Design a protein around this ligand. Structure first.
Ligand SMILES: CC[C@H](NC(=O)c1ccc2c(ccn2S(=O)(=O)c2cccc3ccccc23)c1)c1ccccc1
Lengths: 252, 253
């Protein structure tokens, strides 16, 4: 039926997602669970030193990946049908507020309860090593880990994720949007696509669609705690700097 | 099974009716016209206190806040009784029942508060009154900023045009959240909620067939509710930091 259109939309978004994100969840899980693709593990200072201030070295590295990620997400967004046709100011707005939610959603795919893949999967940084950086740097990663642990339990694959993150981008409740309605119509179509996708890809997973949507609460709260941490760093490390792209994303 | 979900929908509606005296259908009749005393300024407030029987009258802003808390306490008892009607709820671990209510009553209170609101104000005292939104945000800081976010929420929420039969099932879903901190047996909670969510989905499709993804949009509101509740405590604490005994006990939250 029009189901066909919805499948086509799912298929389109999956395709674009692979084109946009060079480290998929499927690649990630395969690394986490071979010989040619095993990661070097950083769990302390010497492992770090052999892998290549320390907490600032790590934070800066985290910044660069963050900037790279926003770049990927921007490319993916433009593939979402209708997105580029929206008012430019709104495109920018949608990007600014969607970027964190997508970054942490996808970061889950790179995480297990013990650590997180880095440097395209070549490296693996342990939760405890990150939990042991000087305050409050030692505390930026725990809520992401906790979220990922619950989120990974949903057992979503890349094809699921492609649609879900498209749904996130097209959030008409973002502050300062000029034309809510066209955004909401793209999102309605994306939601229907997502719903169908979940029903077909996880036909035993009861009300998975609802549980996925419910996980927006946790995402929201994570973003909030993160900006608070950024505000402390601002005043303590005045020698330090946020990347301009990241600056603009946190302005309001 | 599709008949069973409607059985559940109907049971929850009947219970909701027995538990919540002032329903949305009732409130909306009163807001549109078919008649309440209005509070739009300081003079009208005073006249309202000697017209409408207020049960909390024991600054001005403080008096209004205390009344809002009297009501909330009342609502907690209504929500509690309603939750007992939710199939499976009583059969849950007693500590878990207590936890679901404790973390759930606030989201539900704001949910139902929206049934009593429009862009211009809110029904009070069982619909005998109506306090204007302008008169609320005319109150001194921090008090002028406490109902505004509720109003913004309600406007958004009320646009979904839910009725009481819809809301009954939505509220039950909220109570049966398996992510409340400190639960001991999450399984039967999520189980019940799954059943409630199937019920809700079927309810909305049969009662709002023209609204394609109403289910999803309602689910998105649940996160809005958590944001509201989270933000509300951040003000509530500082209110215990402006208010300076048995009474404090009665309203310990
Ligand atoms: C968009 C927000 C952004 N980034 C994050 O909040 C964040 C944190 C850890 C991340 C990512 C993306 C990957 N990881 S990671 O756990 O794999 C990671 C943690 C620590 C150092 C890393 C260094 C390089 C690559 C990944 C790293 C984003 C941000 C904002 C301000 C400052 C720093 C970072």
């Amino acid at each position: 039926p029009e189901s066909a259109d919805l499948r086509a939309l799912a298929k389109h978004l999956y395709d674009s997602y692979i084109k946009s994100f060079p480290l998929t969840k499927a690649k990630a899980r395969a690394i986490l669970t071979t010989t040619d693709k095993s990661p070097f593990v950083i769990y302390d200072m010497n492992s770090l030193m052999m892998g290549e201030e320390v907490a600032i070295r790590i934070f800066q590295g985290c910044q660069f990946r963050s900037v790279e990620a926003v770049q990927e997400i921007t490319e993916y967004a433009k593939s979402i049908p209708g997105f580029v046709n929206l008012d430019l100011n709104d495109q920018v707005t949608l990007l600014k507020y969607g970027v964190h939610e997508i970054i942490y959603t996808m970061l889950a795919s790179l995480m297990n309860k013990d650590g997180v893949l880095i440097s395209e999967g070549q490296g693996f940084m342990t939760r405890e090593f990150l939990k042991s950086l000087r305050k409050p740097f030692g505390d930026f990663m725990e809520p992401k880990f906790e979220f990922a642990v619950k989120f990974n339990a949903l057992e979503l694959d890349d094809s699921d994720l492609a649609i879900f993150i498209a749904v996130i981008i097209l959030s008409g409740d973002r502050p300062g949007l000029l034309n809510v309605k066209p955004i909401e119509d793209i999102q309605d179509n994306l939601l229907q696509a997502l719903e169908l996708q979940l029903k077909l890809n996880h036909p035993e997973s009861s009300q998975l669609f609802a549980k996925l949507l419910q996980k927006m609460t946790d995402l929201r709260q994570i973003v909030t705690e993160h900006v608070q941490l950024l505000q402390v760093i601002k005043k303590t490390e005045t020698d330090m700097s946020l990347h301009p792209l990241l600056q603009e994303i946190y302005k309001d």
